[PDB]
């Protein structure tokens, strides 16, 4: 009942090593489905998910034209920002842009997004009203004025409320067997002694999709937030994700600990304990 589409653009300058590289990738939820790399032998939009392969030549050529044009424009933009910040021509810089639409379980734009960053710092973003901008500094204010004069926000709003949602719904239907299939995590608790009177309890969640998940350790029904080592959710490489949470407990008190797992693919939240 929750879905989104996002495109991620990365433009990187590299003085002395050619023109800036432009890469674009597209995602529906946690599934990448397209890519484009200006450094490719033959720069063209390529499929990265099985359900997008059915799109015809016009779709691919339309995508490629968009990315090829963006490639050239982001080279001008990098030159422009270098100037806005009085930076030398010797450094490498990066502009990133991410945009897309969010849908609720009952279709129609829930919210639209468009944000850009320069060297990893927020630069300019479209406000939630999809009509106004928030510029980070006086440099971004130049971009803002340029974009207002070119009706950039109006065009973006039209896309976010229109084509973005339409195509996202199309992809969701075409790839429903995977995009609309939540795979529950396979779970288990491991025990690793760390000393004579302390042991590590690690709660595992494997093979799940989407990536959103909640893993928590409780002691006597109380959250051990400050004592839990929780690793970043990581991709398995087969579309699914993995994650763990660990806590060091006093040997002999392991039963006072419970691991709680919440995920869309589970019939009901899980409560696990170490099973000797």
């Amino acid at each position: 009942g929750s879905h989104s589409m996002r495109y991620f653009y990365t433009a990187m300058s590299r003085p002395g090593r050619g023109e800036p590289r432009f890469i674009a990738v597209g995602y529906v939820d946690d599934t990448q489905f397209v890519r484009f790399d200006s450094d490719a032998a033959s720069p063209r939009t390529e499929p990265r998910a099985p359900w997008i392969e059915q799109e015809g030549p016009e779709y691919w050529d339309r995508n490629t034209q968009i990315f090829k044009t963006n490639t050239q424009t982001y080279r001008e933009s990098l030159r422009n920002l270098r100037g806005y910040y009085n930076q030398s021509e010797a450094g490498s810089h990066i502009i990133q842009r991410m945009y897309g639409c969010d849908l609720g379980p009952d279709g129609r734009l829930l919210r639209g997004h468009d944000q850009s960053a320069y060297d990893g710092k927020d630069y300019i973003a479209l406000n939630e009203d999809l009509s106004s901008w928030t510029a980070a500094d006086t440099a971004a204010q130049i971009t803002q004025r340029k974009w207002e004069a070119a009706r950039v926000a109006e065009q973006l709003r039209a896309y976010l409320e229109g084509l973005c949602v339409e195509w996202l719904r199309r992809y969701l239907e075409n790839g429903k067997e995977t995009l609309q299939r939540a795979d529950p995590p396979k779970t288990h608790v491991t025990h690793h002694p760390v000393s004579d009177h302390e042991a590590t309890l690690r709660c595992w969640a494997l093979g799940f999709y989407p990536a959103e998940i909640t893993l928590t350790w409780q002691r006597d029904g109380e959250d051990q937030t400050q004592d839990t080592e929780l690793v970043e959710t990581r991709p398995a490489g087969d579309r699914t994700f993995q994650k763990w949470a660990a806590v060091v407990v006093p040997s002999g008190e392991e039963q006072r600990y419970t691991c709680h797992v919440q995920h869309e693919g589970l019939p009901k939240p899980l409560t696990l304990r170490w099973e000797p």
């Binding site: 674009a24 968009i66 990315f67 982001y74 502009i95 974009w147 950039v152 065009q155 084509l163 195509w167």
Partner: peptide, 13 residues
């Protein structure tokens, strides 16, 4: 589908 190009010149930053 990514954001379509405008009728005119794509606006740089």
């Amino acid at each position: 589908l990514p954001e379509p190009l405008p009728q005119g010149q794509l606006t740089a930053y």
